[PDB]
Design an enzyme around this catalytic site. Structure first.
Site: not given
Ligand code: HEM
Ligand SMILES: O=C(CCCCCn1ccnc1)N[C@@H](Cc1ccccc1)C(=O)O
Ligand code: HEM
Ligand SMILES: O=C(CCCCCn1ccnc1)N[C@@H](Cc1ccccc1)C(=O)O
Lengths: 439, 444
Positions: A377, A384, A252
């Site tokens: 994030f 994140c 990411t």
């Molecule tokens: C531009 C860079 C990044 C973006 C846009 C990003 C985006 C995100 C997002 C949207 C989530 C939430 C996922 C969810 O709700 O299912 C997440 C979770 C997480 N990210 Fe990132 N991330 C970035 C960089 C990083 C980096 C550099 C690290 C590690 C050093 C990292 C480690 C994690 C971890 C461990 C989680 C899970 C946190 C938890 O649920 O406790 N990410 N990230």
């Molecule tokens: O929209 C998405 C993409 C999400 C990917 C983000 C993963 N990430 C987050 C942080 N770093 C990686 N995913 C849906 C698609 C779906 C809908 C209905 C049925 C089957 C699949 C899903 O996986 O459920």
């Protein structure tokens, strides 16, 4: 009250074939354009709802009403990331335990210890570009991935992938990427045999990083104690966190740097302001931590790149109890939601009518941004954990890039967004003309 | 390491007698013309530095190196505004607490609730002008002040000053203006002190009256958030002492700089008929209903550029003060010690030829077509950083709505060929600015 719209169906497959496409997020954005702030999406054995408006998403971000759900993408990542931080449920014991142990190693204060190793890899990037021959171009996403992978390997685990010494990425990336590829490909549906072989290769390096065992994540994971349970992470979960951070900590972030450099060369007025700040602030051959915090406009550039193309483009939620969404959409306990981040970031009622324009000045004053309007994030306690890490690395690197080179969009590159589980501008290439400022 | 210039001195009084003048901001601009981007200014017990170039001011706006300082003007205003938002130090607990509590009530989104009451007062302004007899003229800053005071009174506190029913101001305005007058008079220099306290009592009397009437009548306004809002950090609400100071602060802060902006904008429009034509054409095209809507006001893009260009030439809050958080070097040649003060001379910053080109004095709203083309910290009429003007969007929404309706409903004539004369209090206004309005006979 209100009946939810739904995109076209394919018989017994329902909406699933709509995802049988190489750009599924961009397909889902177009459907949101047609259907509005919410639409139902159905698959065999699954029902979810895609949210696009700040009005509904702010309700979905109410942690007393909704908790993080494992999307099908995250469920497939769980096959090798286990109950690491990103693929664990909130109610699993190992989430809060790892969260408590690892949060201290990700503070804005903890970046001071990582900074020197971030500079190490950043200098390697600048020197590669300084050493190109005349008319030789840069493959932007490829080099950004070299940087962010090496940064998390070194900063996190004192391991050197040495990506700038290779044409073919490290034996860990290809296995990881092919596992990630099988994860995303399975969503859109001997691959099972290759999936297990790639998982073993990843577990192979992880036990290699651990085996011989600084100022890094691996120290906290081996020595940190959860103040709640008093326990340290067990050996099984440590491996999963290593896999998690190697994935989460690099891809990411390289997308963000790639999109940021794309938007800069497509908006020369913006690049000029950013380059002037880098030159004014980065007065030393090696940037310091304090100098990086001073790159305000560069940070605004990064946030605006995250607005238009958030590289983790969605996250999923489930209703903790029966509840009504937006006063007109009733949900039952367990009902799932998808937050479509690129669409949320194009809500005209929040950002105005010119949502598609790249204008970092939107972020000049953070207090002018409404709650839950900007979510690259994630949300709440499941946000994140690496946010400050990613932004400090990207700010440092983009600052150094803008200090040392002028950039030319020599091919007049047409934005083409390749989709994995993350987004990247495929084929983005530039030429860099050095300003001949020594390191 | 350059030694900074300093204007002429008066013995032990140092530079202080230079401020003993009725146009001190314009006096300081002329000194900047002669001395350049920076000059030291000294008074008994005081030393500050006046900055005029974008080159140095962009560094001064680095919040890691500089924090808001209370100028001597703000220290005198603090005597009746207390630790309200504008006269509190950043490190005072009540600043961040009130800041956290009051930002929700000032979002670009929060204007939707204020819009109807803004229209209420704006319609009163249009109807006053519709009702003038032939050859009668308009006293522009006076009516703009009627407008902005009533708007903040109504929008903020559900209190009607009813300024369009009076020739003599409401008792609070007279005391407030005379208190503000004494505050400025103290800078350039008794029984004024006895009158100062009487004026403070008149202000606190209306404030304690608004609190009484609200508690005896829930609204959607500022007073509601001040009485019920909680700081998400501490969970505490504002105590009663600070609530009074916030009311005083917003009644002052919420009207007089805004009426100046409207006055200067109308001046520049009538002195630049091509610009007035473009602005009036946008007003007619967008304001297609008898009552402007919130959404229509956001669509008055050129009117907003007109307002920004008026703020460039004559920012109605003409300065703000900063102090160095630590030892630091300004512009690579001016070293500063911890605690050293700076003054940002905003009207001069906005005439920086290296930023705006050789035509800095010309009124050209098109300068603001693209914010990305404007260098950082070149345009600062609402202050800087976390201490920037919390009312910025309120002020700009009100002025856009009102100027939009003015241009829709009337043609304007500079019948006296008005000579710009800028009266200085703590703010700037075009004194004696008068126009004639010929109604276009468009109903409301
Ligand atoms: C531009 C860079 C990044 C973006 C846009 C990003 C985006 C995100 C997002 C949207 C989530 C939430 C996922 C969810 O709700 O299912 C997440 C979770 C997480 N990210 Fe990132 N991330 C970035 C960089 C990083 C980096 C550099 C690290 C590690 C050093 C990292 C480690 C994690 C971890 C461990 C989680 C899970 C946190 C938890 O649920 O406790 N990410 N990230
Ligand atoms: O929209 C998405 C993409 C999400 C990917 C983000 C993963 N990430 C987050 C942080 N770093 C990686 N995913 C849906 C698609 C779906 C809908 C209905 C049925 C089957 C699949 C899903 O996986 O459920
Ligand atoms: C054209 C109109 C306006 C102009 C030019 C203006 C200008 C400014 C400036 C320059 C500052 C910073 C002062 C400093 O740094 O010392 C400021 C602060 C402030 N203004 Fe305004 N302002 C305007 C309208 C308003 C309105 C309409 C309100 C209330 C509704 C308001 C309330 C405030 C407050 C409370 C502060 C202090 C903010 C803080 O420090 O937390 N202003 N204003
Ligand atoms: O220049 C100014 C202008 C005051 C700014 C207006 C305040 N505002 C802000 C928002 N709404 C009102 N003030 C100096 C003058 C001075 C310098 C040296 C010695 C004595 C006095 C000061 O007060 O210190």
């Amino acid at each position: 009250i209100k009946e939810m719209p739904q995109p076209k169906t394919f018989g017994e497959l329902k909406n699933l074939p709509l995802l049988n496409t190489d750009k599924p997020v961009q397909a889902l954005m177009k459907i949101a354009d047609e259907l509005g702030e919410i639409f139902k999406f159905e698959a065999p054995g699954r029902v979810t709802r895609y949210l696009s408006s700040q009005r509904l998403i702010k309700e979905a971000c109410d942690e007393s009403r909704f908790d993080k759900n494992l999307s099908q993408a995250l469920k497939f990542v769980r096959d090798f990331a286990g109950d690491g931080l990103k693929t664990s449920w909130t109610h699993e014991k190992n989430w809060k335990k790892a969260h408590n142990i690892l949060l201290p190693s990700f503070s804005q204060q903890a970046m001071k210890g990582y900074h020197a190793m971030m500079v190490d890899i950043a200098v390697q990037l600048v020197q590669k570009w300084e050493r190109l021959n005349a008319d030789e171009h840069i493959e932007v996403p490829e080099d950004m991935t070299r940087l962010t992978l090496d940064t998390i390997g070194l900063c996190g685990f004192n391991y050197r992938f040495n990506s700038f010494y290779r044409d073919q990425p490290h034996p860990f990336i290809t296995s990881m990427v092919r596992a990630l590829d099988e994860a995303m490909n399975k969503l859109q549906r001997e691959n099972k045999r290759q999936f297990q072989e790639d998982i073993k290769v990843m577990n192979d390096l992880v036990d290699k990083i651990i085996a011989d065992r600084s100022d890094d994540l691996l120290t906290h994971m081996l020595n940190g104690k959860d103040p709640e349970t008093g326990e340290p992470l067990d050996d099984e979960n440590i491996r999963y966190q290593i896999i998690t951070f190697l994935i989460a900590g690099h891809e990411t972030t390289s997308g963000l740097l790639s999109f940021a450099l794309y938007f800069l060369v497509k908006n020369p007025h913006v690049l000029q302001k950013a380059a002037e700040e880098a030159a004014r602030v980065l007065v030393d051959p090696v940037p310091s931590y304090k100098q990086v915090k001073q790159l305000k406009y560069v940070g605004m550039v990064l946030n605006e790149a995250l607005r238009l193309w958030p590289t983790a483009p969605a996250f999923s939620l489930y209703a903790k109890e029966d509840t009504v969404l937006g006063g007109e959409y009733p949900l039952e306990k367990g009902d799932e939601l998808m937050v479509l981040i690129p669409q949320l970031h194009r809500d005209k009622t929040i950002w105005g009518d010119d949502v598609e324009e790249f204008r970092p000045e939107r972020f000049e004053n953070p207090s002018a941004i409404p709650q839950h309007a900007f979510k690259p994030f994630g949300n709440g306690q499941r946000a994140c954990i690496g946010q400050q890490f990613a932004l400090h690395e990207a700010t440092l690197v983009l600052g150094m890039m803008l200090k040392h080179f002028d950039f030319e969009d020599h091919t007049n590159y047409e934005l083409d967004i390749k989709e994995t589980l993350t987004l990247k501008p495929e084929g983005f290439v530039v030429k860099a003309k050095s300003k001949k400022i020594p390191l």
